[PDB]
């Protein structure tokens, strides 16, 4: 029996099974407490039980096993992991561990695992011989990740304008600069929908920091891919924990020949959380930030690369500007030359309100020639020449209203070159 489906399913049928199984009081406790209750009841009754999740290592081998659907929240539902199997399997943090589990004994209140049957969707001995992510030589974004939905939906215009503005490739570092109230959240969720539609094979991941619970749950419901969203309720320590979990799990997954796409919003809040959580080293820059307190966000963002032999790690992040805090645009300025593609959502169109509100002229990406086909290069180049002179607002209206009757990108290109 798998507890992952127990946690995935809502609580109504869990409660009904609680009464139908003979549990005295299941009314008033947490979700993880309820899961622990039914798991303990199964252990007492003697039914065979399995376990799965993502593994994490403490400072002394006090290994834990959390779940993605629980947002890596610490609780009784987590699985204990002793150092014995860690040393005899050479496993590390962020390994997708599935196998047999053991009920807790006296003096210990966490479920343990008896024998692992699979690690990272692979056999344990086959997955034993793997190369570290930092030992893989990066290469260019050879494969183009087209964002075209293809159905001509009422929301496909955003995907089409994103494709024209800047193509998305494997192992690509992304900057999204935008003032507050500019439609970033829906841009990322539309990107997630397009990725799920066009490329179901790739593992889609989304990461959210201090987002409102309604936004968290709408993100969970809208996209089929799993999402990790640490709300503002918990302190910055849980933000650090979930961010490290996500990035290092993605590292392990790309070590297993699986290309990974992750969405983050926003990098500025994550950098601020790291600055607050870490102790100061005695040197403080403008805005209350430190180089030792901020190099770890740079390591996080720079982990994106394309593996030379197989798989990739692509990171797309959003930056906040004009928020009134000096460290915000300070860390924006330091991030001018850290990502290989950048896109701006200029605010002038935001109060013009015609959507999507992106600065097409300012947005751009390097290494177009090695990323997509040549005729596409000449076509976007002609588009850049015809869009450069006039202002950004009327350019946005021009672009959207000539993207209205056109069905696909080829339709737009042929109507452009036939006139």
């Amino acid at each position: 029996m798998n507890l992952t489906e127990l946690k995935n399913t809502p609580v109504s049928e869990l409660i009904t099974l609680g009464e139908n199984m003979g549990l005295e009081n299941l009314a008033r406790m947490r979700k993880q407490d309820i899961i622990f209750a039914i798991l303990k009841q199964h252990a007492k009754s003697g039914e065979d039980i399995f376990g799965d999740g993502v593994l994490e290592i403490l400072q002394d081998g006090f290994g834990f096993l959390r779940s993605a659907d629980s947002s890596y929240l610490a609780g009784p539902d987590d699985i204990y992991v002793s150092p014995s199997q860690i040393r005899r399997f050479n496993l590390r943090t962020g390994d997708t561990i599935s196998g047999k589990i053991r009920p807790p004994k006296e003096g210990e209140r966490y479920f343990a695992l008896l024998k692992v049957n699979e690690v990272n969707f692979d056999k344990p001995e086959n997955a034993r011989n793997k190369i570290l992510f930092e030992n893989l030589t990066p290469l260019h974004a050879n494969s183009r990740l087209r964002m075209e939905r293809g159905n001509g939906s009422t929301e496909d215009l955003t995907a089409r304008v994103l494709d024209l503005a800047s193509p998305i490739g494997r192992g690509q570092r992304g900057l999204i600069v935008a003032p507050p109230k500019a439609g970033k959240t829906m841009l990322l969720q539309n990107i997630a929908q397009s990725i799920a539609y066009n490329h179901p094979d790739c593992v889609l991941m989304v990461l959210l920091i201090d987002e409102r619970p309604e936004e968290v749950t709408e993100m969970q419901r809208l996209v089929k891919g799993e999402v990790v969203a640490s709300t503002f309720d918990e302190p910055a320590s849980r933000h650090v924990q979930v961010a490290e979990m996500v990035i290092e799990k993605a590292k392990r997954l790309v070590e297993h020949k699986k290309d990974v796409i992750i969405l983050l919003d926003s990098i500025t809040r994550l950098a601020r959380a790291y600055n607050t959580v870490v102790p100061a080293s005695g040197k403080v820059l403008t805005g209350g930030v430190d180089a030792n307190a901020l190099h770890r966000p740079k390591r996080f963002f720079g982990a994106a690369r394309n593996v030379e032999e197989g798989g990739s790690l692509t990171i797309i992040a959003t930056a906040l500007i004009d928020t009134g805090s000096k460290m915000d645009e300070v860390i924006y300025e330091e991030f001018k030359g850290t990502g290989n593609m950048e896109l701006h959502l200029s605010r002038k169109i935001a109060e013009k309100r015609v959507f999507p509100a992106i600065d097409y002229n300012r947005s751009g990406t390097r290494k177009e020639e090695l990323l997509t086909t040549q005729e596409e290069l000449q076509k976007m180049w002609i588009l850049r020449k015809i869009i450069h002179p006039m202002g950004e607002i009327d350019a946005m209206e021009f672009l959207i209203n000539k993207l209205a009757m056109t069905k696909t990108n080829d339709d737009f290109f042929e109507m452009m070159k036939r006139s």
């Binding site: 009422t154 929301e155 215009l157 959507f355």
Partner: protein, 187 residues
């Protein structure tokens, strides 16, 4: 079976449009009854306004879909009537239209289209002759009943509602509101 697929697609689209119109009428009746009553019900009145606006948007969408299905089924009927009439009398039509189109296969694409336009105006005059004398005509014998069921033109109660349109942002905000309202009714 494509014609039958168009037929029953149009039938269920018409049924859905009628159901949406009935729901909109019921919502409007409830709204006017509540407005007539002395009870304030401010939030109730606001959600009634929301439900009536989303219901009329849904009515517009259903009418547009029904009109599109009507056009599609009419196009399919025209196409296959032309096809079988054509398999019957292609030689008869070609004997009349020939002196511009013997060498179509050996003609290049632009010359092909030039002959296309010459035949366009030839058939323009050919149909203008009928439409000048203009006697009463009926549907094709094979599919007369179907064409009578769908009819010559869609109902005015659909085109009048389909006259007004919305921007795509309006379309998707109303889509979200409709989904939320359907979910709330489900709960």
């Amino acid at each position: 079976t494509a014609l039958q697929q168009a037929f029953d697609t149009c039938q269920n689209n018409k049924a859905a449009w009628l159901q949406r119109k009935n729901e909109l009428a019921a919502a409007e009746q409830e709204y006017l009854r509540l407005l007539s009553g002395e009870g304030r019900n401010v939030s109730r009145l606001d959600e009634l306004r929301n439900i009536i606006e989303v219901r009329k948007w849904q009515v517009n969408q259903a009418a547009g879909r029904y009109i599109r299905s009507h056009e599609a089924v009419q196009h399919i009927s025209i196409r296959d009537r032309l096809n079988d009439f054509m398999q019957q009398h292609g030689t008869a039509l070609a004997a009349a239209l020939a002196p511009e189109l013997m060498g179509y296969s050996e003609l290049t694409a632009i010359a092909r289209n030039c002959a296309i336009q010459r035949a366009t105006d030839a058939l323009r005059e050919a149909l203008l002759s009928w439409l000048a004398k203009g006697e009463k005509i009926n549907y094709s014998a094979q599919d007369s009943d179907i064409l009578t069921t769908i009819g010559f033109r869609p109902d005015v109660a659909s085109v009048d509602d389909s006259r007004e349109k919305f921007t795509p942002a309006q379309n998707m905000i109303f889509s979200r509101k409709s989904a939320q309202l359907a979910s709330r009714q489900s709960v």
